[PDB]
Design a protein around this ligand. Structure first.
Ligand code: GD7
Length: 372
């Protein structure tokens, strides 16, 4: 795999958690510091239906689905599947929200890097019909059998966009808060039966969370999700919006976010109508920071930036002018610094404080879009 290993000192484990089993329950992929480092065997896209969903998202047909599966169906991501959680410490927690057409497993470069630096990361799978595909179970017996019910991306008419995107961002924020509640409840001993039968014992998570040190991060639709979530749920102490797509947000949110917020943008995605909404968040009484990664495209934040070679990647807009590893390192290091500052971590992430100010040859402070 070309998805990069985490740069931090902790080995990384990965597992999935679904609870309850229904379409209203929480579904998430967990990346976490692992006790041991025995093999990097986590399957990147775990089910064929995700490839069918991606094909539908792309506006293609049945064969493209099968082509993607042939190419990527055995690809791994560098995490130890179901490895035991590293004991003896309480870890800060990030809840991560995916973009439109994505799903929980496609931001492993970010998740694994955060976990390698001592975070637990819960990457939610949304059931708002913004994921390419997702699944749930119709009853407990279906869960026991692995009899999945699949839900695919909803395509919208232009007349539907305003209303439905806002309904979806509200559902996404509810899902982020619900995922947090699930993890915090497990942390404090709530007996939970994972709807998925996996070797990872969820009891390991008891007394494993630093409950004061909680952040929400997300890409594109997931960046709007960060803002909606912060506005509704003060358990999240700061947020990081990776190339946020601001369209779904209602006017009311902009004055309702007390927590610090960090916008990390690509150079090549942003446009004035979007940036002006980010600027609406700024106020002298609040901490807002913004950087732009030079030579990056919207896909630099997601794992498909590592799926292909340089030429094919550039042609398909999965890669920018900048090296994908260099771009994700900047995004991850700047994020770590921001998290250390606003969660009060006692790590060495402040070494990257200059990156929050965009002080690097591959960063622009603020944005190239000077709409004011
Ligand atoms: P945003 C438009 O929700 O981001 C998209 C393009 C993905 C990267 C596929 C999630």
């Amino acid at each position: 795999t070309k998805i990069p290993r985490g740069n931090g000192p902790y080995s990384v484990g990965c597992t999935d958690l679904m609870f309850d089993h229904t379409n209203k329950g929480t579904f998430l992929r967990l990346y976490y510091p692992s006790q041991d480092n025995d093999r990097l065997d986590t399957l990147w896209i775990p089910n064929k239906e995700y490839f069918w969903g991606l094909s539908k998202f792309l506006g293609t047909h049945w064969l493209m689905g099968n082509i993607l599966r042939l190419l990527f169906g055995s690809m791994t991501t560098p995490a130890n599947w179901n490895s035991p959680l590293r004991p003896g410490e309480k870890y800060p927690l990030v809840v991560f929200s995916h973009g439109l057409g994505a799903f929980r497993t496609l931001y492993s470069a970010i998740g694994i890097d955060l976990a390698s630096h001592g975070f637990i990361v819960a990457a939610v799978e949304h059931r708002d019909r913004s994921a390419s595909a997702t699944y749930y179970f119709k009853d407990q017996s279906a869960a026991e059998i692995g009899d999945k019910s699949w839900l695919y991306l909803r395509t919208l008419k232009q007349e539907e966009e305003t209303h439905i995107r806002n309904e979806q961002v509200r559902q996404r924020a509810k899902e982020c808060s619900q995922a947090l509640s699930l993890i915090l409840d497990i942390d404090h001993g709530k007996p939970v039966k994972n709807a998925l039968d996996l070797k990872f014992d969820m009891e390991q998570l008891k007394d494993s969370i630093d409950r004061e040190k909680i952040a929400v991060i997300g890409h594109s639709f997931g960046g709007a999700t960060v803002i909606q979530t912060l506005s509704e749920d003060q358990r999240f102490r700061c947020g990081i919006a990776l190339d946020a797509w601001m369209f779904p947000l209602g006017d009311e949110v902009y004055s309702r976010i007390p927590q610090p917020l960090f916008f990390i943008n690509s150079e090549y995605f942003q446009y004035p109508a979007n940036i002006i909404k980010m600027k609406k968040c700024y106020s002298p009484d609040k901490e807002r920071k913004m950087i732009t990664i030079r030579g990056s495209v919207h896909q630099n934040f997601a794992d498909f930036t590592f799926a292909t070679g340089k030429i094919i990647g550039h042609m398909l807009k999965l890669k920018g002018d900048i090296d994908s590893n260099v771009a994700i390192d900047l995004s991850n290091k700047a994020s770590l610094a921001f998290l250390q500052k606003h969660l009060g971590l006692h790590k060495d992430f402040d070494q990257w404080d200059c990156l929050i100010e965009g002080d690097d040859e591959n960063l622009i402070p603020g944005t190239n879009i000077n709409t004011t």
